Design a protein around this ligand. Structure first.
Ligand code: NI
Ligand code: NI
Ligand code: NI
Lengths: 99, 571, 114, 571, 99, 99
């Protein structure tokens, strides 16, 4: 596999996304790390599916609303950054206020 | 010209009269003073005040004043004269000045001990909070990873003892004998925090204590497992007088040698540090809190009891069986715990913190205490006591500064005063060491951005190192340049007694870390402790364990939902 | 057969140090708080609240298994067997009442009052 | 007074006559002796024997005897005179004494070298097993992380060679030349284990070997890849005589220079260490076990073959192609492997360990061997040989001590004797270094609780550092204070030759680690190896590779389910 | 996310819980780490759902029986400790012999 | 759990297998680390199920074809090595060209 440190640390963020989606299935208001986990995974999966930077930014904003998270989580997240591997290479994904 | 405070707050941050909410709590802190002339605010960035011939200057670094680092206008939260907005200066790993930064040659009202030049590297002080790093007086040296969890919550100083995961260390903070002391002073070379080793204070002779003082111990430790006898304390105090160090006690909870009033007679009114003054961790059951009424005592507290929760009663009945290897089948072992799990003193402990009686806050890490929840559990108690007891007569009519300044003093300046390291670390004052913590008011008391130690960042929040910025996810805390190579040792301090320093422990033990001797441990009292100088009368019922302070029952109802926990943490 | 990591102990009880004198004493807790005394604690240098024949406890510990301690509740009176210390019988500390030796025992035992 | 052994075992642990089951195996170990007078058992805890004036004492440390650490009542498993219950004492990083602890002034029958005082920090010895740490004589220095996996199974000593993941190192344990030796002796400064570097023993001249001796090697290495010629061995042994060091051999599997008869004549009856005496790892095929019949030889074995499993045949046919870069398409490369995968010698190897012929155990890490399963695979073979061959005539009628004592000797005392470090470490004896391992009998041979190195805990089982105890999950092993700062170097030993020690390798190479020389490598024989002094007659069929020992076919049927593997491990 | 080391190490324990309930679905006797993994996750999930210390202790004891684990796993687990984040804060969860 | 370093590193390889199976469900050509992840987990799961070295080697070769992976992934994988815990102990698993 020859997993570089950038690839190894991108697995602990995926482990949290399965817990975020599993808690969403039971009907729970996501916290700060859980909300950012499920927001960042859509950018990595979007880049894997071959989606453009414009599409993944707007798609990452339409994942969760204010009723899907706890009271005050939207106030402390005015921006969400993450780097994903696209067809052309590694590109930044800035989501200005997804809730 | 004139502009609204909304656009000013969005760039330069708050000022005089602005109140800041501390996360999801009900506490608001107002700025008492702004030490800057409006118009010449110093900030770094693309085409901003800090450039050649504007904020910087052509003069040399030797001109005492050129800073090594500057925090561009931040809200300080100090216990001496905090809640102020001012530019803080760093030079030689110490706080140079607190006021206004820039070039005095082209800017009016620049503080003399605060000038930006060619040697300064700025920090975005705006929209953030600055404070002195936390100190933990009850640390069982069970694991070295413990420091990473402590430093990940704003605790850059440790005080305690131990070898490793030995049952002896698991229950008592001791590094006994010169051999163990030297090995631990040398193992601490690979740690990114200040350390103060505590020796075993259980002896009838003067000699065994003298051997540990000259080896390099900041104080002594008297545990119930090693025998908290009247002679063990008398001899530990007698030696602490002639050595100028602090003794920490975990009194006999079995009431074997005597009662609580007999151990106070054995103290002979000599200054002493009392761990877990409530009683969960240890001490003469039931009336331990009674010790916090005398002035010589320096009361501290473990953090699993604070804040007082609804489910706190259940967890501590099983927790008590592992720390001091007590059996669940022996009647003398379980019947002994029935008294120590008293819930009336845990609620009293929480209000005594608000009244200003329990002068400081510790943990008792991996032995009935959590090291990575200290600053958090302080602010959690502050939210509960404001919501129940309301604003104090000393507290202002429109802000909660007095309570926060009283509560931050318990983890910053008071533990430093207790262990004789006030002059080194404790408060954000001029001439002191640069052991500071930075957090957003949104994440105050739980998750800091950076942790400056000796003017260099030791630990901080960091994203993907391969990314184009430091903010991209996964953002988990990692060791920085202040915790790498020889700079970790330079920026960290191995505290010892003057005897050890004079003998030459740094050379004999070969310590590349900074070595500062502790002092002013014995003459200090509760009046010298900041914002917690009260010595009230006490009356404790021994049957039902009810606590009455000045003829008034001290208690409070437990809370189910506390401030900042599942909303920020994951596990 | 026995489970993993278990101990197949032999069917025989352990015998605790024989050929040592025994002294039975009635101990009553006068104080309103509970007291628990451990195996090797010196009874003569214990709390003054406990009312018992103090002179009979010279350099004598509890006659129970090591480690273990017996609890006394407020008011409760309990009979306790006492055993002398081994070796040189030189004990130090506790409450600075003796800090010395107790095995003189030359015919009727004397010297050192409280 | 009298009390049952059930309540005594629940507090103070077992004693004389009590049998302990070693995990899920069919092996039971009985206590041969108890070195304590019943009544004054020393244990630490809340209101227990180890307090002021009871177990402790007012006298100073310098009174030779006051321990730095004591293990309160543990079941020792030593090969010299093990399976005993006694208090073990630690002082100056060495074993002070083994018997009874406490204060001799108030306790009868206290051992003179063993006294608890103000300098002692106790360990819960009860309900646990103590032993000497393991040694691995075949270690390819391919990765430094290898040590963490080794130390995570009770192996605190390494012996071998290498630079890093070079094909040269991947197949041979060699650090060739003074430059490479120096760089590796200096890289080992950041390792938490004892190390013994082996040089290349392939030369016709005396000089190239002398350069490596004085550089700081504990011995030489003769590999088939670098040429295992009669002259390479003769000159390696000639130099090993005058230097007092041990040569390790991986004989020519191709039978190029000669047969097994040629190599034993080239040895000239001089003591030598033979790696993989079975033949999977290497050595002139087929009759490589035949070398075990000579007394000068010190036979060791790799651990992928032990225990002999049903599926062991398949993995070896492909594993052999990577370690010694053999191609699967060349006929000469695959046809020589057909002989080396012989399954009759693997079953003989397992029976020869029970008989006491194969005197020690190694691994051959990351090159046909696993470093983190040595103690495990020793106990796995012990379970298989008891279930098939039954109790030995030398073994007792009611316990399996003889087999366990014979098998623990293969990883503890015998490899230390082979590499001339018996006096330093090998057995739990007085005056030796404190390199000990602690495990529950439930998790014996697979997962230890702690790993004491030079009197300090180097590695141990640890939970969440932020938690209120060391037991909460996730419990994964992490480096302790004995592996932090300058204490890692102090507690670890860089073994070298006398020639190097007297030359001043510690000063020339600048080694902050402890430097002890190896000695008594040449005069030793098979009789000096503990519990494995057999030199039986041997007859090997060259066609079908059948092995007959003293006119009796040595073999055994393979096993599908082995002891302790899926039940405890995850991956 | 600003994941503190206490949160990062609590992900490797959840990675094992998915493997434990996937092996339970196929009908396999769980080993020591797998049994403790699915025992500890119910305390963390219980604390997330807002369950009290009394409820999660008794619920953690009624997850697996002696027939659901391998022979000897119950003998080596007389106690299971773990810290989870409750509504009031971090609390200890001691499960004395869950099998 | 007393997870040895060999067990801790075997969790990050499991985290990737769930992402490989999830991307396979959507119909995506697996890359080098994803292909090796789902190849290695069948050996660890095979060893857990009690399958022999012969069975798991041949079963690991019949998981994916050339059409199930990206163009060129088969050319750079002439061999796949991994160690799994079998009923008899830890054993090597060499899969010579699974595509
Ligand atoms: Ni304590
Ligand atoms: Ni080899
Ligand atoms: Ni090898």
């Amino acid at each position: 596999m020859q997993l570089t440190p950038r690839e190894v640390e991108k697995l602990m963020i995926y482990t949290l996304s399965d817990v975020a989606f599993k808690r969403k299935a039971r009907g729970l208001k996501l916290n700060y790390p859980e909300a950012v986990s499920i927001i960042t995974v859509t950018a990595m999966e979007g880049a894997r599916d071959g989606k453009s930077v414009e599409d993944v930014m707007k798609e990452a904003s339409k994942v969760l609303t204010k009723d899907d998270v706890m009271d005050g989580v939207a106030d402390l997240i005015p921006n969400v950054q993450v780097e994903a591997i696209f067809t052309d290479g590694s590109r930044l994904v800035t989501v200005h206020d997804p809730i | 010209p004139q502009i609204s405070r909304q656009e000013y707050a969005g760039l330069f941050g708050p000022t005089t009269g602005d109140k800041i909410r501390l996360g999801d709590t009900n506490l608001f802190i107002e700025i008492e003073k702004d030490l800057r002339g409006y118009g010449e605010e110093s900030v770094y960035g693309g085409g901003k005040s800090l450039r050649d011939g504007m904020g910087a200057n052509n003069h040399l670094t030797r001109d005492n004043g050129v800073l090594d680092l500057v925090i561009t206008n931040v809200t300080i939260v100090d216990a001496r004269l905090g809640v102020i907005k001012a530019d803080v200066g760093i030079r030689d790993g110490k706080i140079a000045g607190i006021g206004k930064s820039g070039n005095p040659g082209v800017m009016d009202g620049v503080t003399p001990g605060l000038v930006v030049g060619v040697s300064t590297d700025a920090i975005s002080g705006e929209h953030l909070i600055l404070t002195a790093a936390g100190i933990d007086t009850h640390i069982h040296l069970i694991s070295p990873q413990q420091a990473y969890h402590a430093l990940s919550n704003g605790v850059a100083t440790f005080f305690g003892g131990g070898i490793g995961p030995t049952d002896g260390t698991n229950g008592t903070t001791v590094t006994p004998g010169p051999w163990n002391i030297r090995q631990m002073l040398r193992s601490v070379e690979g740690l990114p925090v200040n350390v103060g080793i505590l020796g075993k204070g259980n002896s009838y002779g003067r000699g065994p204590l003298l051997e540990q003082a000259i080896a390099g111990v900041v104080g002594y430790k008297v545990h119930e497992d090693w025998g908290a006898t009247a002679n063990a304390l008398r001899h530990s105090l007698r030696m602490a007088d002639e050595m100028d160090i602090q003794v920490s006690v975990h009194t006999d909870s079995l009431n074997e040698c005597g009662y609580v009033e007999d151990t106070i007679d054995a103290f002979e009114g000599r200054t002493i540090h009392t761990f877990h003054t409530e009683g969960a961790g240890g001490g003469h059951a039931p009336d331990i809190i009674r010790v916090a009424s005398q002035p010589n005592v320096l009361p501290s507290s473990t953090n699993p009891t604070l804040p007082y929760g609804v489910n706190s009663q259940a967890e501590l009945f099983d927790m008590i069986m592992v720390c001091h290897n007590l059996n669940p089948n022996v009647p003398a072992d379980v019947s002994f715990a029935e008294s120590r799990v008293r819930p009336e003193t845990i609620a009293a402990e929480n209000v005594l913190h608000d009244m200003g009686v329990i002068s400081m806050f510790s943990s008792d890490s991996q032995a009935m205490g959590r090291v990575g929840e200290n600053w958090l559990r302080v602010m959690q108690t502050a939210n509960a006591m404001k919501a129940s007891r309301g604003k104090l007569p000393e507290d202002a009519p429109g802000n909660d500064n007095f309570r926060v300044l009283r509560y931050v003093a318990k983890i910053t300046i008071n533990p430093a005063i207790a262990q004789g390291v006030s002059h080194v670390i404790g408060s954000v004052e001029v001439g002191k060491m640069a052991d500071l913590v930075l957090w957003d008011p949104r994440f105050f008391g739980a998750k800091p951005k950076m942790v400056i130690k000796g003017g260099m960042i030791n630990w901080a929040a960091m994203g993907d190192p391969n990314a184009s910025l430091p903010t991209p996810q996964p953002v988990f805390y990692r060791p920085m340049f202040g915790a790498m190579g020889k700079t970790m040792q330079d920026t960290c301090v191995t505290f010892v007694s003057q005897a050890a320093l004079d003998d030459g422990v740094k050379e004999k033990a070969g310590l590349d870390r900074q070595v500062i001797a502790v002092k002013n441990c014995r003459t200090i009292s509760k009046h010298d402790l900041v914002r917690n100088d009260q010595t009230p009368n006490i009356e404790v019922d021994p049957e039902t364990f009810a606590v009455k302070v000045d003829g008034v029952h001290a208690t409070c109802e437990p809370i189910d939902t506390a401030a900042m926990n599942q909303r920020y943490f994951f596990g | 057969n026995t489970p993993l990591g278990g101990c197949i102990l032999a069917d025989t009880p352990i015998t605790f140090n024989e050929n040592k004198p025994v002294t039975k004493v009635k101990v009553r807790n006068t104080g309103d708080r509970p007291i628990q005394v451990g195996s090797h604690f010196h009874f003569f240098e214990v709390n003054r609240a406990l009312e018992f024949d103090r002179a009979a406890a010279y350099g004598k510990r509890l006659n129970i298994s090591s480690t273990t301690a017996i609890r006394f509740e407020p008011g409760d009176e309990t009979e306790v067997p006492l055993i002398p210390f081994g070796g040189k019988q030189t004990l130090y500390g506790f409450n600075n009442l003796v800090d010395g030796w107790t095995g003189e025992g030359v015919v009727p035992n004397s010297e050192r009052p409280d």
